[PDB]
Amino acid sequence: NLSDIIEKETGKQLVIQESILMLPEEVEEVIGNKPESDILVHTAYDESTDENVMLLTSDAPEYKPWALVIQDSNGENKIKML
């Protein structure tokens, strides 16, 4: 899966439940890196750490990793650019 690259960068067997598509303008504000073109925000949930695990990739055909975000019970994000 594309979820394998999640398992790679974090080591957690999680299922991607949603891929929301957003514009660079939207993603930039939160991560502080304006990306090339639109991004898909694949969000899986870790039901044990209560973390939202996010994988941001390039649009549909080629799902190119771009950044990874882990978001805790509070809302702070450990952002790792990919």
């Binding site: 439940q17 949603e18 598509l21 957003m22 898909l40 925000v41 969000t43 949930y45 996010m54």
Partner: protein
Amino acid sequence: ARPLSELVERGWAAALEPVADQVAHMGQFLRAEIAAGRRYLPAGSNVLRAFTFPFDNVRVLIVGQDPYPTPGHAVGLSFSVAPDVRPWPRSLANIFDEYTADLGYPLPSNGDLTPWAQRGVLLLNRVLTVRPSNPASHRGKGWEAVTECAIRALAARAAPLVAILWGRDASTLKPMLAAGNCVAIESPHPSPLSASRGFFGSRPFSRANELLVGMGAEPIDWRLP
């Protein structure tokens, strides 16, 4: 099947009449997709389910994107999942928090949104189908033309409409409902990455209602536990 009237509530028949050729085409695409060995997720019966509830009874539009890419999740309606779906889409989780925050209500027992649908909240995705595990795989594949006509038709009616538009993808449809009797309320997407950026606190369920009332229409119930 084939003829529109046999496929959607009628009234929706009228609505989508101009995209009849366009929708009929979508069929042989899907059929062609199975023919080529791959399957699509939304599920035969449910693909057009969005348009099974009365056209004249819609008061609130919640436009989504394409369907949830994982099997057994997508159910023919924006954002909603199937009741057995346990750890639910984080977008939906967030939507729900703002939902308990906004209205007095307790957290829903499941992400089954059917009741909203049958109360005049149109949960229309912009792209009605999608290849399993391959998000956005049916974008520009013909569907937008349909969902777009869907919307224009709603806007044209004498009846008042509130469209709530989560994410910028949605916003592109703002112009598409000339705000005569239509009001659009936009906000960042309920996705975790963006939710706290201005979705949370947007109070869309009540605002939607108050807007409806402002225009001499009945409020939606919401409320699903």
